[PDB]
């Protein structure tokens, strides 16, 4: 989930404090890339 | 020896200055809103 | 174990009521345990076996029975969301404050999985909110990692 | 598209093409897939 991934511990502080990933990131479920734009009559889609 | 160094030293030396770097692109996908300009990044190009 | 206490394990397990009350009518134990220490009642709040959970108290299964490692059924129950096992539990005599061989209490488990109902049935029961387990996490500790934004409110 | 038109640029003109399509061809048109990224001259943000 991308909740877990968001509290991957980077590091801890001198001050004991934590940097977990989602302090340096935004995390979301998304594509493996994005170089196209498919459009069905103007709407998002997809295919085969 | 005169310079400390070893053929381990020169073998990473080469890997690291021989090397062809994918760098992503300006204005790469995801883009942002408003973006007018697409182009590659060229880092490091094998040696010739 | 011995004969009749294999056949009440699995039949708690696998949620079989009438078959759980032919076995205790028949004078198997309450408290048989596998090798990993669960007696019935661990099993059946494992699986949620609300009913089980009911028949295996009234017949005088130990309610604060510990596995192996020191786990309760209230932590087995509070862990994976089954609140009105926990209620059951709770009723009738379940420690609220157990903590297993690592400190892990009900409510860090409650807490940790998200269970807000649960948690605040655990308070209403007596859970100390600053209990620790053996890194020195409480529920609230818990609750800012995970990001629960709720639960952290809940716990002061 | 001219070179290093991005990906936005290049969805305004095919979001005119399938308007096109769909409007002043109504009668004849079912559907549009618009594909941004790619050509049959190559890919890229300036093609599709």
């Known amino acids: 989930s991308t909740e877990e991934f968001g509290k991957i511990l980077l590091k801890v502080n001198q001050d004991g404090s934590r940097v977990l990933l989602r302090d340096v990131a935004k995390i979301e479920l998304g594509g493996e890339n994005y170089d196209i734009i498919a459009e069905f009559n103007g709407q998002p889609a997809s295919g085969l | 020896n005169k310079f400390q160094l070893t053929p381990v030293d020169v073998i990473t030396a080469i890997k690291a200055q021989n090397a062809q770097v994918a760098a992503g692109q300006l204005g790469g996908t995801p883009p942002v809103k408003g973006q007018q300009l697409n182009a590659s990044i060229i880092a490091q190009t094998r040696l010739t | ?156 | 598209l001219p070179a290093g038109a991005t990906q936005e640029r290049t969805q305004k003109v095919l979001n005119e093409v399938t308007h096109y399509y769909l409007t002043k061809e109504k009668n004849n048109v079912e559907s549009v897939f618009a594909f941004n990224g790619f050509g049959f001259a190559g890919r890229g943000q300036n093609t599709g």
């Open chain 3, 1 to 156: 174990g011995s004969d009749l206490g294999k056949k009440l394990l699995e039949a708690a397990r696998a949620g079989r009521d009438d078959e759980v009350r032919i076995l205790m009518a028949n004078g198997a134990d309450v408290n048989a345990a596998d090798v990993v220490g669960w007696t019935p009642l661990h099993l059946a709040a494992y699986w949620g076996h609300l009913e089980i959970v009911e028949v295996l108290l009234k017949n005088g299964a130990d309610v604060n029975a510990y596995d192996t490692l020191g786990s309760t059924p209230l932590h087995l129950a509070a862990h994976f969301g089954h609140l009105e096992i926990v209620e059951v539990l709770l009723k009738n005599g379940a420690d609220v404050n157990a903590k297993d061989d690592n400190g892990i209490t009900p409510l860090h488990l409650a807490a940790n999985r998200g269970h807000l109902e649960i948690v605040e049935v655990l308070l209403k029961y007596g859970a100390d909110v600053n209990a620790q387990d053996k890194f020195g996490k409480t529920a609230f500790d818990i609750s800012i990692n995970n990001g629960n934004e709720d639960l952290a409110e809940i716990l002061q």
